[PDB]
Assembly symmetry: D2
Homo-oligomer: 272 residues x 4
Amino acid sequence: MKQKVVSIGDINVANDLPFVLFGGMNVLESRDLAMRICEHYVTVTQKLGIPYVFKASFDKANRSSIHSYRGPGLEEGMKIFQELKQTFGVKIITDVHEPSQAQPVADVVDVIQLPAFLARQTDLVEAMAKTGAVINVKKPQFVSPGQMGNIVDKFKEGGNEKVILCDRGANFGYDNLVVDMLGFSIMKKVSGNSPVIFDVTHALQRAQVAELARAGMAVGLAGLFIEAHPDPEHAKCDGPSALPLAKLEPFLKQMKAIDDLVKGFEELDTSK
Amino acid sequence: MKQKVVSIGDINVANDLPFVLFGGMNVLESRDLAMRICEHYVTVTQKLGIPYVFKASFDKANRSSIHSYRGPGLEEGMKIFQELKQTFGVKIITDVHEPSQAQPVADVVDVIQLPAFLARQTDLVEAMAKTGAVINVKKPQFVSPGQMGNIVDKFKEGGNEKVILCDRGANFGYDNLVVDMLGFSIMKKVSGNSPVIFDVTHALQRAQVAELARAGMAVGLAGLFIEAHPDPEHAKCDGPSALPLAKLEPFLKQMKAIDDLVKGFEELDTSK
Amino acid sequence: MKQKVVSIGDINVANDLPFVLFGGMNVLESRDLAMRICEHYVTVTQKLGIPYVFKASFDKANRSSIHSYRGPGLEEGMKIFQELKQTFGVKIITDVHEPSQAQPVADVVDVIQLPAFLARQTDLVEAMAKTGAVINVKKPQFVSPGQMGNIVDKFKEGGNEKVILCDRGANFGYDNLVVDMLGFSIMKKVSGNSPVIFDVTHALQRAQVAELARAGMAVGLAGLFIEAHPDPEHAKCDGPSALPLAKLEPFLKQMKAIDDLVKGFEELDTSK
Amino acid sequence: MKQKVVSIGDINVANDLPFVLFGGMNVLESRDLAMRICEHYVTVTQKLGIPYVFKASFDKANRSSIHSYRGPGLEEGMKIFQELKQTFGVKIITDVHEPSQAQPVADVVDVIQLPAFLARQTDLVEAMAKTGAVINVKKPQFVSPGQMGNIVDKFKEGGNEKVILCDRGANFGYDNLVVDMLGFSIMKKVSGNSPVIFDVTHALQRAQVAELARAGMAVGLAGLFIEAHPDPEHAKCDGPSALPLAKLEPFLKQMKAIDDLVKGFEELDTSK
């Protein structure tokens, strides 16, 4: 059984291919920051030899208080990815929230993204189904790994057949998430074997980002989604749990050593 | 400690007042159906003596397949509640999904409603925060009962201080919901004691709608949300689990006998 | 469909009969305490009109530190229930832990009890299966409500067909319990409709013992298990959460008003 | 921070040392089977270079029906490990259930074992606390990873300071288990850094035994517990999910490649 490949330009994402990193930051605070962050990634990846798709959000739909930092905005956010593309030559992956934002961003960026909270939103999906651009469905925390068929189906119909599934853990009691390492295969299966990626930073609402990233990779994955910040501490807020830039490399060496050791194993059948 | 009252016209919703029923149907299939359903409710309530707010959806945002029954639509759906208002003289409660639908419906209906999937959507909330109409926040299944403060806060700010909290269970493992009967007080507390209601039919993804409705009511609640259909069987699909019209009355007698017996108990303190 | 009755002397426990209280204390600290506690129960029940089966533990198998208060012991504990029986004329319900303690206690007490931790212990069950005395199986927190068939089966075989099922909640994430109010019927069903009782104090690892007891009773139950202490505060430790003696009555009035209102309802079918 | 070592004869178990396999079978059906199984392990380990502690149960306390295969028995079971020791020269690890079985087995075998169901059993623990032999505490499914302090404490007191912690997943809703890969560090921590091992076969109530074993090992563990059977199919029953003997080797190559790649990584700090 072969894996479905979903190519993002020259990059080919797929469950049996070496993992692709969809690194980056959470929100686009300031280009001086984006630029620095994305600068460090590019360098680290390039050096270690890892495909990459810088990720960042230009909009914040579910923030605290109305009087909060919405975000650059779609019209000002998009202009930033512009500069980063030229200056660095990397792919941009961003999340849309309203059915109208679909097409605009589709041009500007390589891989768009569907938020879990909305995963189940026909109008927004169909609008993304149009564009035809690479789709990344974030697996909602309140949905089992085997329900990811209808989501991919609802995209096939929309004329879009380039989809990646992102897992970020599941609810474990109140205010808590646990990642089911068995959920990754159950997702490959029901999705025609589409690419499955692990959003480690977002599955961790710590000095834990590593042990948890190793377990994910050892399973064998198409990719890995993560976020980092120059100063996690002071800047700490809530939602995800960013990785410390200065640790990117020794952390990515961890993955490769795993993603390679495992990515080249003789198929095993514990089934019989 | 007194309870916050949120009046919907002549109706006053509140945790220590007799429960209000927000009955109705799931979607607005056809007026000949709406009319029949709402006809049976009105009669049954009126007879037994229960405040009531017919409920129905004119739009379906998260349905299966793009080629499915979207719904009447906002422009054709609203015209229906019109006729039902005059013909019956009951309150209308409906759910909006896009920040623009806010105001239109605000006029047409008494109590609007915020979907859980979007509960965390500032733009849509703020747009609902404007209208100033009575708000009903559906407690997401992936959020603990004590997180319902920020939601009510984000509404106060929007200039809207008329809010009801609706509980519909919490994730219990994969593809399953359990209702925490302790969640109701933890919600009254963090919400300035705003009204809390139980969506029994939606907390049941059966011959169970009753035993589960009794436990909810015995706790003591501001209200109760439910849905019924003339023929649950054949029409069965998915999402909620409608009540059989023909059983409304013997089921509502159950509640009153509970909601009254409990609603008039001498405050008890097991605390000390 | 009629309910299986399990009579404890002159007392008949059963799902459609008025609820039986299996009140009491946690451990047998001192007779001066047992006597006081059991004195207050007897009086309160007798007065309100409720069957009763004083409960207490003479042994503590899973306590903290080896250097802790084991408990009176089986040989000294049993002597206490002796005095209480004569002085008060009430039934005694206690838990055994080792296959040998079975018979001794069987004489001394009316209703024995099987701990959840051991629920799955053939030797201990079979030893209890012998005695022939009334059995009370505590539903383990890590076992679904529909697995309670094998336990009752494994008792039928042992020649014992007098069994009650006690529910005390289920694991909800780490260090937490939620009570599934739907679990009670699923238990009646698979157990030939044997009596089902709710251990409210033990399902609460508060000023919550009441709201949670009302929901349980409103479902409709054969009985109710609870524990109380003169001074919950200072004495507070861990395991259960005792009720304040001084609140027994106003709390039991709550139940009767529920257990009676519900226990005499016209059978309802939300099924069709 | 160094790890606590717990040596079983010439074998040293510890979180930063290469993983130790505690392979074997579930129950001791027949020596012709034990011998075959243990024969295949010994050979495979010896060849690949892995410490090993054959495991098997001589007693079945929580089986179905009283009329089931109890097991060889303590007096006949122990005689078997005898023969296997001489014939193969491997360590024996077995589980005891009654406070009296403690010492007898302590002689006969290298590493004893405490069942989760009883994890919280002072008398049985203290009896095991005596013997002084290597202890293996099975982490109950209904207990969080940070509660494993009291268990190790209750053993220190008993005069026994040679303990290993075994994780086999946690309850995820009804009748289901999920393994929290973050639970392993939280266990090292509260246990003075005692050895932590993963019972993969028992955390799986499949063709999944592998992907799940890789994630566990990639975290970094002191050991790994597993069970295999010549013919998993036909023999299938319930409790665990045995590995197919014929797949031991290609499955253990998987682990070593992981346990070695990870066991020799430059300590990383994602903390800051």
